[PDB]
Every structure is written in C-alpha cells, then in structure tokens.
Amino acid sequence: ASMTDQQAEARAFLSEEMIAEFKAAFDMFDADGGGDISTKELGTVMRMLGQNPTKEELDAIIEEVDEDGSGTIDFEEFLVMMVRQMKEDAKGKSEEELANCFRIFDKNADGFIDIEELGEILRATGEHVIEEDIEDLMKDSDKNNDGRIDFDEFLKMMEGVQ
C-alpha cells in the first residue's frame, strides 16, 4: 500500500462502522467486479435502473474520480467521494435565503458588496465607528482579500453574526 496520502486521510474520516454501511451501496455497483468497480460493471448497474449510458462515456466518469491515476473505481475511491461532500463550507453554499440578503447589501446591483456601500450603511446607524476599524474588519473577514465581499465569503459572513 503506497502513494496513499489523500486516501489514508479520507479513509480514516469514516470508522469501520461507517465503512460497513458504505460497503452496502458500494457492493451494488460492484455486481460483477471484485473489491473495485470498473467501466463495464458501471454500465450494467445503470441499465438496472433503466438508463442505457455509453461505455466510453462511463470511462470518462471514472477518469475524473481517478485523482491519482488508477483507471477503475476502488473501495477507498468510493469512500473519498463521501469525504468530498461533507465539506460543511460547500454544504451552506446552497443558501438561497443568503443570496436575497446578499443582493440587499449591493444597492448598486454589481454582484458583490463594496466597502463604500457597507461603510455608509454601517455608519447610518449613528454609532461613533472609526473607518480604521471598518476598513480592517473587511480585510480581516476576507482570508484572500480581493477588495469586495462575494456570495462565497457571504456564507461565513452570515454564518455566525453574534
């Protein structure tokens, strides 16, 4: 077992108790395989539902999963797939409610929030705030610091507003 850096991490993400439940669905696509799934085995499982996909088309679907460059689908490859979906950050990306409030902040209708828009908006409350604290707050919330706040950063921006 060599060249298992990302696999040895996504594998440790689920214990043998979780891996067992994932093995039930994995063995389904693994109908005529043997521990791993292949292109032909996938096409046969798709036809079980009633879909008749292409074999060469399914081969490309596995090529994307072959991050290291194996060729067919493995069991730990099936586990890392669940490891790339529990990313809570991308789980809240579907926040359609945040997209509505997000557009409220950009009253200029540009797509992202600017410091000029949030400056007078926050100062309009009347509190004696300083521009040195407002400007630093914007650059401190953006880990990459692009200049404006986009819907991507908006997720964590409205994640904990206490």
Question: Is 136 annotated for ligand binding?
Answer: no
Q: Are residues 23 and 67 in the same domain?
A: yes
The secondary structure of 71-99 as a DSSP string is SSB-HHHHHHHHHTT--HHHHSTT-HHHH
- 68 labeled part of a ligand binding site: yes
Q: Which of 106, 114, 104 is nearest to 149 (CA)?
A: 114
Structure tokens at 71: 């060729």
140 among the known binding-site residues?
no
Residue-by-residue DSSP string for 118-157:
HHHHHHTT-----HHHHHHHHHHH-SS--SSB-HHHHHHH
Among candidate residues 88, 111, 133, the one where a domain is terminated:
88
CATH number for the domain that contains residue 129: 1.10.238.10
**Which of 152, 130, 131 has the alpha carbon at shortest distance from 141?**
152
- Domain that residue 139 falls in: 89-162
Closest Cα partner for 138 from 159, 124, 154, 125? 154
d(CA 56, CA 132): 58
Question: In terms of domains, do 5 and 75 share one?
Answer: yes
Residue 36 labelled as part of a binding site: yes
Among residues 88, 111, 144, the one where a domain terminates is 88
Q: Residues 73, 112: one domain?
A: no
Measured distance CA(23)–CA(13) in Å, rounded: 15
- Is 70 a known ligand-binding residue? yes
Which residue has tokens 């400056």?
A: 119
Q: Note whether 132 and 67 are same-domain residues.
A: no
**144 is an annotated ligand-binding site residue:** yes
Q: What share of the chain is helix, strand, coil (3-state, %, to 5)?
A: 55, 0, 40
Query: Does 145 count as an annotated binding residue?
Result: no
Q: Are residues 24 and 98 in the same domain?
A: no
Biggest CA–CA distance in the chain, Å, is: 71
Residues in CB range of 142: below 8 A, 6 or more apart = 149, 153
- Cα torsion 121, 124, 125, 127 to 10°: value is 110
106 is in an annotated binding site: yes
Residue 159 shares a structural domain with residue 141: yes
Same domain flag for 120 and 97:
yes
Is 150 within any annotated ligand binding site? no
Size (the chain), residues:
162
Q: 111: buried, middle or exposed (CB in 10 Å: 19+, 13-18, 0-12)? A: exposed
Do 121 and 147 share a domain, yes or no? Answer: yes
The number of distinct structural domains making up the chain is: 2
DSSP 84: T
